[PDB]
């Protein structure tokens, strides 16, 4: 009300409204789902178009051979944050000959987003990210919020109507975690999960976007007729 003019102002109840408004931008964004087993990790994203003449906005971005994310909210902010991850993953390789741990990647994103929430002049990031990866401690899935909060999860979903997919994963927890050494079945579970967030529209060939990373599988994105198999 009077305490939402900038990011440097607490409300009387201890709330940061500019951060909460940035969080709102994520809810307006299109749905994206993340889930993993012990061997693989999968991203599934519902892409959004402007109209029938327009293309479908890309949702998934590659960060390294072993790491990448999906976005929901302001796309340009995801480009900035993903670029930062690309640099950090790359700094780890060039200096330490070391693939960046997914947990450490989350810590770096948290700290980058935090600086924007405590200083005058700037603004919080208006995007949520689902980071997947495979490192020395196996498969991983992270959820990033622009408040700074990063959370390691078995599965999750963000965006509009994301609660439906999140409930499904909460039921299926014991099943999909055990899908080891079977990428196609893990993707099926992700496609079935994101389907719980659909209304009116359904999954078409240029609508669906899938990505996967695993033990002997580099981070690869599937679009177009490559995802027709899973429709």
């Amino acid at each position: 009300n009077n305490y939402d003019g900038d990011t440097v102002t607490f409300s009387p109840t201890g709330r940061l409204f500019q951060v909460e408004y940035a969080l709102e931008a994520i809810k307006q964004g299109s749905v994206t789902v993340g889930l993993r087993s012990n061997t693989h990790a999968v991203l599934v994203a519902l892409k959004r178009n402007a109209d029938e003449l327009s293309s479908y906005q890309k949702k998934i971005i590659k960060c390294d051979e072993h790491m990448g994310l999906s976005l929901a909210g302001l796309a340009p902010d995801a480009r900035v944050l993903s670029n930062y991850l690309r640099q950090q993953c790359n700094y780890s390789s060039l200096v330490f000959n070391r693939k960046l741990a997914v947990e450490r990647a989350g810590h770096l994103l948290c700290d980058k987003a935090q600086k924007n929430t405590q200083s005058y002049g700037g603004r919080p990031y208006g995007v949520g990210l689902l980071i997947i990866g495979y490192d020395k401690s196996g498969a991983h899935l992270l959820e990033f919020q622009p408040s700074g909060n990063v959370t390691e999860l078995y599965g999750t979903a963000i965006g509009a109507r994301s609660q439906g997919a999140k409930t499904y994963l909460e039921r299926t927890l014991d099943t999909f975690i055990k899908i080891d050494g079977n990428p196609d079945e893990l993707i099926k579970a992700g496609v079935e999960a994101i389907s719980q967030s659909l209304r009116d529209e359904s999954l078409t060939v240029d609508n669906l976007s899938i990505a996967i990373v695993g033990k002997d599988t580099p981070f690869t994105i599937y679009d177009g007729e490559a995802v027709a198999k899973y429709i």
Binding site: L94, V95, F96, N97, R98, A101, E103, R104, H107, K136, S137
Partner: protein
């Protein structure tokens, strides 16, 4: 640009079937003066890596602190710091190699020659060299300074190529290293009798031996040598 002041001489090393051995004497020379006799130039990093350093001792102590700080920093927000995400020999080497090459590119080098010896997660032997110029190379045997000229020839008789590594035991490798250190004591004017030796094995882990001495030395034949040509008495 500087000049080295207090210096440490040769560091020698080799691979064997289950790991690596590295050794270096305990002397800190001040030109021709054998000034400091209790200097440790092998510095362990965790339980899987030993960094052996020759050259300027003040720069060595600086590197020693960088490594100590590296371990501390790796443990930060890392529940797997003593397991899967522990520091590897390849990580430690590449860090040092990055530092050495950056410093030479600013014309302000760390006046050292470093050998990183260790065993990786998968049991593979690691042995790589780096120096003040940022020059890096790997070999079944590695040595710095005088060791390059006198030790490598002896160690290459045991492991001449890659295929000789599985055929070489720890007893044979340690014996070859200890003999090499004796030869260096005979012939390097900036060496000492006292030295340290480290073994990093993929089964038995890190064994760090201090206060070793060169023994079984041959001097008796000196009594018979008289004059410089024609003198008989």
């Amino acid at each position: 640009t500087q000049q080295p002041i207090v210096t440490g001489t040769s560091v020698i090393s080799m691979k064997y079937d289950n790991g690596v051995i590295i050794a270096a004497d305990n002397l800190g020379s001040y030109g021709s003066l054998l000034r400091f006799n209790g200097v440790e130039r092998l510095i362990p990093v965790g339980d899987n890596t030993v960094v052996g350093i020759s050259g300027d001792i003040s720069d060595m102590q600086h590197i020693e602190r960088l490594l100590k700080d590296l371990v501390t920093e790796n443990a930060y927000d890392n529940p797997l710091a003593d397991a899967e995400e522990a520091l590897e020999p390849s990580y430690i080497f590449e860090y040092l190699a990055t530092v050495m090459y950056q410093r030479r590119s600013k014309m302000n080098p760390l006046w050292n020659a470093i050998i990183v010896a260790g065993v990786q997660s998968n049991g593979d032997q690691f042995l790589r060299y780096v120096n003040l110029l940022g020059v890096t190379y790997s070999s079944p045997t590695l040595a710095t300074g005088f060791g390059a000229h006198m030790a490598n020839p002896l160690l290459r008789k045991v492991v001449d190529r890659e295929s000789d590594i599985p055929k070489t035991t720890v007893q044979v490798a340690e014996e070859a290293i200890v003999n090499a250190m004796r030869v260096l004591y005979y012939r390097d004017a900036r060496s000492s009798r006292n030295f340290s030796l480290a073994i990093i094995d993929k089964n038995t882990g890190l064994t760090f031996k201090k206060n070793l001495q060169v023994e079984n030395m041959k001097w008796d034949f000196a009594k018979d040598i008289k004059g410089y040509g024609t003198q008989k008495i």
